[PDB]
Amino acid sequence: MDKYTALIHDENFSTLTLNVSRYPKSLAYWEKLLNYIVKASAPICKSTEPQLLKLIRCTYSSMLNEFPYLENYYIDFALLEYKLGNVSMSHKIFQRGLQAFNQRSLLLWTSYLKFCNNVISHQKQLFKKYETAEEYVGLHFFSGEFWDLYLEQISSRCTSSKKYWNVLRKILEIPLHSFSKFYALWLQRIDDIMDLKQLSQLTSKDELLKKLKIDINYSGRKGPYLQDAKKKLKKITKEMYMVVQYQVLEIYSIFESKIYINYYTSPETLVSSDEIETWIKYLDYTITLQTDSLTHLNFQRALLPLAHYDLVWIKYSKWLINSKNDLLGAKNVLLMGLKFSLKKTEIIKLLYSVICKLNEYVLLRNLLEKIESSYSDNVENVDDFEIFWDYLQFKTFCQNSLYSSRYSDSQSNGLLNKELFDKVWKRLSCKEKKSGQEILLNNLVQFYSKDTVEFVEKNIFQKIIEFGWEYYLQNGMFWNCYCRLIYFDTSRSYLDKRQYIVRKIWPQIDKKFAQSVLPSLTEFCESYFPEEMDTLEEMFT
């Protein structure tokens, strides 16, 4: 047998593979399984077993579907595909990894350009990749290493040397962590100017004559005139340095000193509360500055330690809603936040409402169908009530709009529809195992019309009476909601409803339950029936 079959009949490959297959999201299992596979190929070469190489590519690519933000493994899968020889697949792995991060990542752009340098060999296109990298990641606080790459490529390839000045003048205004280095390059590269015509490298001719009073066409003794010119340009650089030093020292001292973790780890890692607080404040600072490249970069840069939380998926969505006025942008942010975050309830709530504002109701129907399908057409039985209740509100909006009303005065039947009322009754029938009983009753009360009040009274109030469910009968909120259903009927007159509540409803409750029911029922009575407050107190003592 070959090295592949010796690998596939190993005892360890069964357990490592099988632990990954049991626990897909835990990632120490994926890393042990992958390290073992790669190590059992003693030397990776162009002649190692093609079944074994196909097994390696399947392992890394499935891990990069499960955990799309691991930057270092996109780089490692690209370098492995380089060593095997085909630089085209390694191009596609770097571009796939850049795509996972919406183009906005410094490590992947830095490594993709250090790679690209060797293998492009077409100069206009190699430089167009640096001009693409610079618009997405160029304003990063740690982006000095990118600009070193761009400047060394310019200084080797270009013959003219105007492009170096034109790039370095832009770099002079970015508040980078290593901003001084490029000020020192500009100062040395000014200091080596050896005549007047070189000063047209720096800026334009007219700006020198008008703003700084330097004439390049000055014919005369040109020595001291040049020393005066260099003194003036060193002063204008001093003021620009002073601005950028204020920016950089402010950003470092408040915010960037405080963040310690800059990279995605695994869906099971926690972040300290300090870093959550300074990421929230640092995003607020960035949004104030109003540089949109830099706000998008800083949200993407902030999703790395805390992709799986959801406070920044919500926050980035809100910034797109109200500060940029963009709802399709915010839908795409929240929709992508479903993939990452573990909580998902606040995102689904806000995404339902973003879709409803975007007038795309069929997508809302599909998300409601996927949430009822995810619980096996049985959302009524979910332990966590917030899923069921948000589902049910937006499903009711779709349902009132979809089926015309059955009751008078165009009173849209919300929970009184045979599809929805069966879910509500099926959750009411579990009585203590489920969580959200009083909220569900308390929203069923709100109909206020004679036809609607009669249906709600007969189906949930009379029926839980006659079944004798002790949970609902001992509970004060049940009786309070029933009295409040009848009392706010616009149909019944005052004597009718007071007659009904005191004479029909209040005898029905048992006297053993008085110690449980009388706190709430008194609170109804004093609020609306001060006159009958003796009767109640007499009925239960």
Partner 1 sequence: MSQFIYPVQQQPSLNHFTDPNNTTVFIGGLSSLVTEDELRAYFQPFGTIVYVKIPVGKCCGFVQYVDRLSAEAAIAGMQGFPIANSRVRLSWGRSAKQTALLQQAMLSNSLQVQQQQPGLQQPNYGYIPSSTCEANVSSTMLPGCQILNYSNPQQVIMQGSEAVVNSTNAMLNRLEQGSNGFMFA
Partner 2 sequence: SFDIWKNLDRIRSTKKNAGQFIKGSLLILPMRTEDKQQFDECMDELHKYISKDILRCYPQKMLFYIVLKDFNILDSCFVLSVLLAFQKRLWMAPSEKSYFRVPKNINLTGSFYLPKNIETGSSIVEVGFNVVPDFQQFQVKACHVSKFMNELSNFFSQVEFGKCEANVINYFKREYNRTYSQISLALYELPLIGDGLFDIKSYISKTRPIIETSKAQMIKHISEMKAYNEIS
Partner 3 sequence: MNDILTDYKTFYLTHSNIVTYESSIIDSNTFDPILYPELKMSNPKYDPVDWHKKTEWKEAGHIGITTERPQISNSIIECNSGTLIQKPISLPNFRNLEKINQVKINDLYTEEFLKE
- Please say whether the dihedral angle defined by the alpha carbons of residues 426, 427, 432 and 434, taken in this order, is positive or negative: positive
* 322 lines the binding site for partner 1 (CB under 8 A): no
Q: Residues 282 to 301: which contact partner 3 by CB under 8 A?
A: 284-285, 288-291, 293
Instruction: Write down the least CB distance from residue 20 to partner 1, Å.
Output: 19
Torsion on CA atoms 359, 361, 364, 369, rounded to nearest 10: 180
**Contact track, partner 3, 413-432, x by CB under 8 A:** -xx-----------------
φ/ψ of residue 42, rounded to 5: -60, -50
Interface region with partner 3, contact rule CB under 8 A, candidates 70-78, 95-103, 365-373, 398-406: 398-406
* 435 lines the binding site for partner 3 (CB under 8 A): no
Q: What number of chain residues touch partner 1 (CB under 8 A)?
A: 36
Contact 492, 500 (CB under 8 A): yes
The H or E element that residue 156 is part of is: helix 144-157
The H or E element that residue 78 is part of is: helix 71-83
* 268 lines the binding site for partner 2 (CB under 8 A): yes
Q: Which of 343, 365, 463, 497 touches partner 1 by CB under 8 A?
A: 343
* 242 lines the binding site for partner 1 (CB under 8 A): no
Residue 523 touches which member of partner 2, partner 3, partner 1, none, C-beta under 5-8 Å by kind? partner 1
Q: Which of 197, 235, 281, 511 touches partner 1 by CB under 8 A?
A: 281
Residue 108 touches which member of partner 1, partner 3, partner 2, none, C-beta under 5-8 Å by kind? none
* 152 lines the binding site for partner 1 (CB under 8 A): no
Beta strands in 5-83 (DSSP E): none
* Residue appearing with tokens 């340095």: 241
Q: Which of 104, 296, 308, 427 touches partner 1 by CB under 8 A?
A: 308
In degrees, rounded to 5, the angle at the alpha carbon of residue 342 between the alpha carbons of residues 340 and 345 is 105
C-alpha–C-alpha distance, residues 21 and 125, integer Å? 43
C-alpha–C-alpha distance, residues 286 and 298, integer Å? 7
Alpha helices in 172-291 (DSSP H): 179-191, 199-202, 205-207, 223-251, 273-289
* 361 lines the binding site for partner 2 (CB under 8 A): yes
Q: Residues 12 to 51: which contact partner 1 by CB under 8 A?
A: none
Work out the end-to-end distance of the chain between its first and last CA atoms, rounded to an integer number of angstroms: 90
DSSP string, 506-525: HHHS-STTHHHHHHHHHHHH
* 227 lines the binding site for partner 1 (CB under 8 A): no
Instruction: Write down the least CB distance from residue 360 to partner 2, Å.
Output: 8
**Contact track, partner 1, 163-202, x by CB under 8 A:** -----------------xx--x------------------
Q: What is the 3-state secondary structure (H, E, C) of 254-278?
A: HHHCCCCCCCCCCCCCCCCHHHHHH
* 318 lines the binding site for partner 2 (CB under 8 A): no
Instruction: Write down the least CB distance from residue 327 to partner 2, Å.
Output: 7
Distance of CA 222 to CAs 122, 209, 219, 236, Å?
A: 42, 16, 7, 21
Q: Which of 373, 401, 462, 499 touches partner 3 by CB under 8 A?
A: 401
The token pair at 497 is 């409803």
Closest CA to 456 of 499, 498, 407: 407
C-alpha–C-alpha distance, residues 143 and 179, integer Å? 10
Of 7 and 283, which has the nearer Cβ to partner 3? 283
φ/ψ of residue 382, rounded to 5: -75, 140
Instruction: Write down the least CB distance from residue 246 to partner 3, Å.
Output: 5
Q: By CB under 8 A, name the binding residues for partner 3.
A: 128, 131, 134-135, 139, 162-163, 166-167, 169-170, 173-174, 200, 203-204, 207, 211-212, 236, 239-240, 242-243, 246-247, 250, 254-255, 284-285, 288-291, 293, 318, 321-322, 349-350, 353-354, 356-357, 359, 361, 393-394, 396-398, 400-401, 412, 414-415, 443, 446
Q: By CB under 8 A, name the binding residues for partner 1.
A: 180-181, 184, 249, 267-274, 276-277, 280-281, 308-311, 341-345, 383-386, 435-436, 438-439, 442, 523, 527
